[PDB]
Amino acid sequence: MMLYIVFILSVIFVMGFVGFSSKPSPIYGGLGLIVSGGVGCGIVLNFGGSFLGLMVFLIYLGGMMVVFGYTTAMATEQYPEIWLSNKAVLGAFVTGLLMEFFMVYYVLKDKEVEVVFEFNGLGDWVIYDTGDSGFFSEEAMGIAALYSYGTWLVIVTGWSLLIGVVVIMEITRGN
Amino acid sequence: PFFDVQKRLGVDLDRWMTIQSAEQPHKIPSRCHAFEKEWIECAHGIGSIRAEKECKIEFEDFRECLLRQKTMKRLHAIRRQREKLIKEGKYTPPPHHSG
Amino acid sequence: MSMVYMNIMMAFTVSLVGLLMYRSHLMSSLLCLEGMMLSLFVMAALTILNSHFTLASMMPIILLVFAACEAALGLSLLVMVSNTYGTDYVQNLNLLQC
Amino acid sequence: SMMKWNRERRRLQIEDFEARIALMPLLQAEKDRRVLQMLRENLEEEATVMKDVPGWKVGESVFHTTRWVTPMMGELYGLRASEEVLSATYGFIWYT
Amino acid sequence: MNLMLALLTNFTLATLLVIIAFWLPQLNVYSEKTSPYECGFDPMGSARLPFSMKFFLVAITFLLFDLEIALLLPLPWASQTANLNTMLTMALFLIILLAVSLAYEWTQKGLEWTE
Amino acid sequence: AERVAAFLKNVWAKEPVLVASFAIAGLAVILPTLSPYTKYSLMINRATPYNYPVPLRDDGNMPDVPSHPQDPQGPSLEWLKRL
Amino acid sequence: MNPIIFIIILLTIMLGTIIVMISSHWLLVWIGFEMNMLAIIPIMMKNHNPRATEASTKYFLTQSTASMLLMMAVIINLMFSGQWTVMKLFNPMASMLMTMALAMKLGMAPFHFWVPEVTQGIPLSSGLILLTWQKLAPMSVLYQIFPSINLNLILTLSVLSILIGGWGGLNQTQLRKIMAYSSIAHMGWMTAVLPYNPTMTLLNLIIYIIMTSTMFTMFMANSTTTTLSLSHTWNKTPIMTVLILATLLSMGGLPPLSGFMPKWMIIQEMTKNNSIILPTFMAITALLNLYFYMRLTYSTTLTMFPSTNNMKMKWQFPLMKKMTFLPTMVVLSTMMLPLTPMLSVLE
Amino acid sequence: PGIVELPSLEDLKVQEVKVSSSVLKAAAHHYGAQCDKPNKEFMLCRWEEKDPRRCLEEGKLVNQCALEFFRQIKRHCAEPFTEYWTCIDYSGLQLFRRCRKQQAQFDECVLDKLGWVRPDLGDLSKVTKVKTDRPLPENPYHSRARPEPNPEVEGDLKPARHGSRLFFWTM
Amino acid sequence: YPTKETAHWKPPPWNDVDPPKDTLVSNLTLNFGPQHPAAHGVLRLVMELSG
Numbered sequence A: 001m002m003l004y005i006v007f008i009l010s011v012i013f014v015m016g017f018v019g020f021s022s023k024p025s026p027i028y029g030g031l032g033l034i035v036s037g038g039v040g041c042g043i044v045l046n047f048g049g050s051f052l053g054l055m056v057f058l059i060y061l062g063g064m065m066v067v068f069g070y071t072t073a074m075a076t077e078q079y080p081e082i083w084l085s086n087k088a089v090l091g092a093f094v095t096g097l098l099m100e101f102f103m104v105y106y107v108l109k110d111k112e113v114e115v116v117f118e119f120n121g122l123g124d125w126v127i128y129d130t131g132d133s134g135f136f137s138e139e140a141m142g143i144a145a146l147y148s149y150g151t152w153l154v155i156v157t158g159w160s161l162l163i164g165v166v167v168i169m170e171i172t173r174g175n
Numbered sequence B: 001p002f003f004d005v006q007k008r009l010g011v012d013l014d015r016w017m018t019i020q021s022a023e024q025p026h027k028i029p030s031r032c033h034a035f036e037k038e039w040i041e042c043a044h045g046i047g048s049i050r051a052e053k054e055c056k057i058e059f060e061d062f063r064e065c066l067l068r069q070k071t072m073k074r075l076h077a078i079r080r081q082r083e084k085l086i087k088e089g090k091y092t093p094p095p096h097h098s099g
Numbered sequence C: 001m002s003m004v005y006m007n008i009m010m011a012f013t014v015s016l017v018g019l020l021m022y023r024s025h026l027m028s029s030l031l032c033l034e035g036m037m038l039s040l041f042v043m044a045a046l047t048i049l050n051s052h053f054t055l056a057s058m059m060p061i062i063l064l065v066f067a068a069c070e071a072a073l074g075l076s077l078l079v080m081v082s083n084t085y086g087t088d089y090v091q092n093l094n095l096l097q098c
Numbered sequence D: 001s002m003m004k005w006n007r008e009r010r011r012l013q014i015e016d017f018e019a020r021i022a023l024m025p026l027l028q029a030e031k032d033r034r035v036l037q038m039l040r041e042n043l044e045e046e047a048t049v050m051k052d053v054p055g056w057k058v059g060e061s062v063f064h065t066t067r068w069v070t071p072m073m074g075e076l077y078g079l080r081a082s083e084e085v086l087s088a089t090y091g092f093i094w095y096t
Numbered sequence E: 001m002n003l004m005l006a007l008l009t010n011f012t013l014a015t016l017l018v019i020i021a022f023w024l025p026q027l028n029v030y031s032e033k034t035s036p037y038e039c040g041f042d043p044m045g046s047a048r049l050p051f052s053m054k055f056f057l058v059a060i061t062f063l064l065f066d067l068e069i070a071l072l073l074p075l076p077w078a079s080q081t082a083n084l085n086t087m088l089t090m091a092l093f094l095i096i097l098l099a100v101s102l103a104y105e106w107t108q109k110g111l112e113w114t115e
Numbered sequence F: 001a002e003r004v005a006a007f008l009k010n011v012w013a014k015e016p017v018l019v020a021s022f023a024i025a026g027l028a029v030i031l032p033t034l035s036p037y038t039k040y041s042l043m044i045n046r047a048t049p050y051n052y053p054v055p056l057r058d059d060g061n062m063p064d065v066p067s068h069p070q071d072p073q074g075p076s077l078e079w080l081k082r083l
Numbered sequence G: 001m002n003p004i005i006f007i008i009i010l011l012t013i014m015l016g017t018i019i020v021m022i023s024s025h026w027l028l029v030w031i032g033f034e035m036n037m038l039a040i041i042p043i044m045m046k047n048h049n050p051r052a053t054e055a056s057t058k059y060f061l062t063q064s065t066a067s068m069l070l071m072m073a074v075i076i077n078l079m080f081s082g083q084w085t086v087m088k089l090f091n092p093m094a095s096m097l098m099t100m101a102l103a104m105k106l107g108m109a110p111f112h113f114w115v116p117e118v119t120q121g122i123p124l125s126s127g128l129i130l131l132t133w134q135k136l137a138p139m140s141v142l143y144q145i146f147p148s149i150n151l152n153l154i155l156t157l158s159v160l161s162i163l164i165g166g167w168g169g170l171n172q173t174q175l176r177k178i179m180a181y182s183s184i185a186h187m188g189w190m191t192a193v194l195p196y197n198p199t200m201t202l203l204n205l206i207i208y209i210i211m212t213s214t215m216f217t218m219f220m221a222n223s224t225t226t227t228l229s230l231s232h233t234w235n236k237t238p239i240m241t242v243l244i245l246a247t248l249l250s251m252g253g254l255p256p257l258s259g260f261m262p263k264w265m266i267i268q269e270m271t272k273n274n275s276i277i278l279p280t281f282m283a284i285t286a287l288l289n290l291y292f293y294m295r296l297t298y299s300t301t302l303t304m305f306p307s308t309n310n311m312k313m314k315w316q317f318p319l320m321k322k323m324t325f326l327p328t329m330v331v332l333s334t335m336m337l338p339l340t341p342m343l344s345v346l347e
Numbered sequence H: 001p002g003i004v005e006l007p008s009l010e011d012l013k014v015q016e017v018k019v020s021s022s023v024l025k026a027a028a029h030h031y032g033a034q035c036d037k038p039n040k041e042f043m044l045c046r047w048e049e050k051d052p053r054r055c056l057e058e059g060k061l062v063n064q065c066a067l068e069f070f071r072q073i074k075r076h077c078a079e080p081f082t083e084y085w086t087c088i089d090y091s092g093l094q095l096f097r098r099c100r101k102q103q104a105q106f107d108e109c110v111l112d113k114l115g116w117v118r119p120d121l122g123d124l125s126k127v128t129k130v131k132t133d134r135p136l137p138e139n140p141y142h143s144r145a146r147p148e149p150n151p152e153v154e155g156d157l158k159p160a161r162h163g164s165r166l167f168f169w170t171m
Numbered sequence I: 001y002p003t004k005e006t007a008h009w010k011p012p013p014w015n016d017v018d019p020p021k022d023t024l025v026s027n028l029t030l031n032f033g034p035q036h037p038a039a040h041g042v043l044r045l046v047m048e049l050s051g
């Protein structure tokens, strides 16, 4: 049912994580993180944040494109490993999906599960707000306050990105 | 804060985002604004040792609004009971609950 | 604590367990750090968007800004490791003994 | 030209927002009755479903305070059909 | 619903075209036909060998600048605030620091590809 | 004034893109501090009614608050209709 | 490295730490650590040799993992309290992650394996920052969240640190590895008194910094990084060996030296809270520290190890090292016990 | 704890205003000029009472006044109004810009046959004052009694008795 | 305290600088032609490429 779209996207979100957490060739690990970024954008986008969902997808699409170039230069071998070529990779991949299956199986059967925290399986739609906003997007108004309210945040992040460029040149200088 | 430069200098560096009942753009309220305000006003100036026991009612309502644990349990029981009655043909849903 | 929070918190645990169990490639571990940041971004965005905490809506963006700095910093170190040994294997990083 | 037309666009926006501001009292009044009607219908139906449960008290509040708490989506559409629940939850986000 | 159905149709059409491509034509597969292409002579080594990136430093810098678009894209909404003096100050400060980063890397020969 | 003109001509002959960049950016920082219309941008943003104007309970001692929308009291947008 | 760039990166390290101390919002605290790690690593890579690359990489991997756990704690604390204030956390699971994240940053046992290796792989000046300045930010956070810290977790880490630090320091001949294991052991004393009196955590941190900064300054003066290299100091700078003796005896907690004060005050607070078995165990286990400080005095000041002929050439040149604040630090690290009641200024 | 009190379905019964969104937007400016007092009364009740159950009676007078408003349009301006809101209804954004000629015909009918003057720009966004006999709520949040503050410490600050009293120290 | 595990440990270099590893630069060899538009048909240009 489409009422569980958020839950169905979060299952793919975990499956993508098991994709790169099992650590095959970073080429295939990068693909797994793109799938998680794509569905993660979908999950966030269904809670009312379209800018946040599209932005994280946009940032991670460029992030894994640099990682792809770095994988062909410094993280490549003759036979890049897939989720089936190695027992250690395959073992961790099957284990991740089985735990995902059991958690999904129990939450949809009992409507509850207790692991550190107590989770509810009624559906994500039961916690949404029943009132409408006005003529604006609340997420957009909060993000636009960074420049009027977040003067201190803009300075530290701005300085951090500046020093970030200085640092990477220093680290990679080699002399 | 370990060093309270903000309070002495009179500069607000990060206090404006610490609570969700503070001033927001366009006076947009948070869903648990009333509950947070009550817990903050109950436990003002009395220390966390006292507030942990004397403002326990407000803080439990505030946590109920935040995570809705007790409401979802209540909905679960009603929904579970309705299925049991329907599964054994003992309850007819009304029209406005079906269409 | 809806059923979505379970999967998001499980994603963080998977990426954490993935980061703490190295295979060979330093690049494979760097992906797990970027995976963990993604989980924290999603989990924070969900909580903030659901509670209508308007001003907190910028926090997830500020979380991505400093995730890139770390990711760029981790890549810069990976260049120098590769230039010294010809691979990004972590078993070569053992000249220093505890 | 661009700044002259954008200036006119701001005045057309204020007019549009004032049209909403004229209707909000009527819309708010309707919404209050609609929300209260739905809650009562769930209360009249919780009584029949939960008549046999031993310790159940129909309409009990989960909060200590007697203040009005805005119902969340589950409380308001707890027992209604999935078709109307789907539009009340994702109707706006999905309308493109 | 509409967006999801639009995506399903686009990738279903793409998939069906690929399926037809592999099942409609007559195939004659043999070893030499599917060998890797290197202009007529056998490749000397594996294509999976390391491939040096001479613009690695510029690629790292792309990660940092690609995060400025996330911070800069809210500007159209930021201009709607009542605190224009503060908003315009931090908008220009943020863009200027982005420019100083470019100036530093440019002057320090950071944008030049390694030999 | 002679040696400085040499610098400008030299850059204008070798980095015309950068000369245009710095000139454009300099105007962005300077003109707003001088334009008389900058104050109206603040007023237009403040005059846009996103929220509902919640009425004030009338205690009988608020002469500057209108009782009806079309009363003379209260802020006026006559300036905006001519700006 | 350009001197201006070194100064800017140095100030960025301080700014990150200062942001953590003045921040009242959790997000800013996290930003402080991220800024601090961003600036520290280039100072570790300054000499650009394979050991420095390994040290920086091991340091980055550990610190990056800790910052992820700290952000998880902040978000979990946000879900259960709906506020970002830097105070006691409102969820037990958030406290454990934050406590462990702060333990990894400090290098407490059993998260200590990087401290001996990172310190060995970087120069002495970079090591001094690693073992003195990097401890201010994590200790700032523990000082503010201690009411919610699980008592068993924090005391367990403290006890393991005192044990591992003492044992690890016995099998070492490298000064940077000796100072590294000494640091781990001293972290235990700071965090052991944390649940009972956070003021004494500040006292031990201040005294530990002064003594630690004094040892590195004296090792930096002679460019000594090994026990045997330090064994030639008596034949070049005899005065420097006496100062090393007094400081090392102070670090061992022997009265009437300054370093006895933090142990003495920490035992007082724990015994007031009816904690008797732990202070006794901590004091006795600290004798492991005093043993491999005594072993350094023996080969440095109390005996005269063999010299080499070329040493005679070093007699004709003075010490051109800056040795900033060394005369002041050595005095504060040895003669401060009569001023012990001045610990009240920290309150 | 406690039972949530809800009105009966008879308390929520009222004659609805069954007109589409294009009808409301076409008449919004005149509607907000004529029905201000019952509107602002109800809107003050919601923000002061913070409870929809405490403003049902005011919420009915909003409906009653809106009906009388449209009945007057239905008696004098029936045809010009229909053309106006038909043209607003055509646009996806319900823009005012595209119906000025039809708006003028609607504005002149009410001006002559009813004396209604359209509010100027910025009028309906004004914060106004409303007279009401309804008492001001005293505890709208249903707050409990705030805990008593810690006994404040005040007085003259004398020197520490016998100094620090730290072990053997005399000062 | 020597043990069997630490029998092959040796003290680090006096200046923290380990010898650089034996040159293992792996240039990429590519056939540029003969069947190549820019090879003029019958040129087999074997090129060692770094990037």
Ligand SMILES: CCCCCCCCCCCCCCCCCC(=O)OC[C@H](COP(=O)([O-])OCC(O)COP(=O)([O-])OC[C@@H](COC(=O)CCCCCCCCCCCCCCCCC)OC(=O)CCCCCCCCCCCCCCCCC)OC(=O)CCCCCCCCCCCCCCCCC
Binding pocket: G001, G002, G003, G006, G007, G010, G011, G012, G013, G014, G015, G018, G046, G123, G124, G125, G126, G128, G129, G132, G133, G206, G209, G210, G213, G217, G220, G322, G323, G324, G325, G328, G329, G332
């Ligand atoms: C006096 C009161 C005593 C009170 C006692 C209480 C305890 C406090 C005292 C602690 C003792 C600290 C000093 C230790 C000795 C320093 C070592 C030394 O001799 O220098 C050699 C050594 C360099 O020798 P080298 O390795 O051969 O060459 C390095 C380069 O390769 C060379 O490359 P180059 O040739 O291009 O040159 C680079 C350039 C570089 O120049 C500098 O070194 C300047 C560094 C910036 C310091 C600026 C002063 C701080 C205040 C500035 C105001 C803004 C601060 C906020 C910034 C954010 C706001 C924007 O020049 C230098 O290197 C100058 C030589 C170093 C002199 C350092 C003098 C300042 C240290 C004392 C002040 C502490 C500063 C905070 C520590 C920084 C942490 C990262 O110095 C260092 O690199 C170490 C720096 C110090 C790190 C340890 C500092 C202690 C950390 C604990 C905090 C203590 C305070 C809080 C707790 C206690 C109070 C309650």
Ligand SMILES: CCCCCCCCCCCCCCCCCC(=O)OC[C@H](COP(=O)(O)OCCN)OC(=O)CCCCCCCCCCCCCCCCC
Binding pocket: E096, E099, E100, E103, E107, F022, F023, F024, F025, F026, F027, F029
């Ligand atoms: C109030 C807030 C606004 C102010 C913000 C403060 C920051 C301003 C700077 C932000 C932009 C960062 C870049 C600034 C440095 C300029 C780039 C640079 O570093 O040039 C160094 C240049 C290196 O080139 P080189 O290899 O030496 O060969 C040419 C030699 N002539 O060596 C050189 O020869 C350069 C010679 C000096 C160049 C001066 C450039 C000044 C730029 C600012 C001018 C703005 C005003 C102009 C517009 C007026 C209004 C129309």
Ligand SMILES: CCCCCCCCCCCCCCCCCC(=O)OC[C@H](COP(=O)(O)OCCN)OC(=O)CCCCCCCCCCCCCCCCC
Binding pocket: D003, D004, F024, F027, F030, F031, F034, F035, F036, F037, F083
């Ligand atoms: C590649 C990109 C860069 C291209 C070069 C940039 C352009 C050259 C720089 C000077 C011009 C900048 C301003 C841009 C044009 C402004 C708009 C315009 O020209 O229209 C004139 C307009 C007329 O008034 P208006 O009220 O709009 O009348 C119709 C209203 N219905 O006027 C207005 O409405 C607004 C009046 C304010 C105009 C702003 C400029 C005045 C700034 C204060 C004086 C300082 C001038 C600079 C001198 C100091 C710097 C050297």
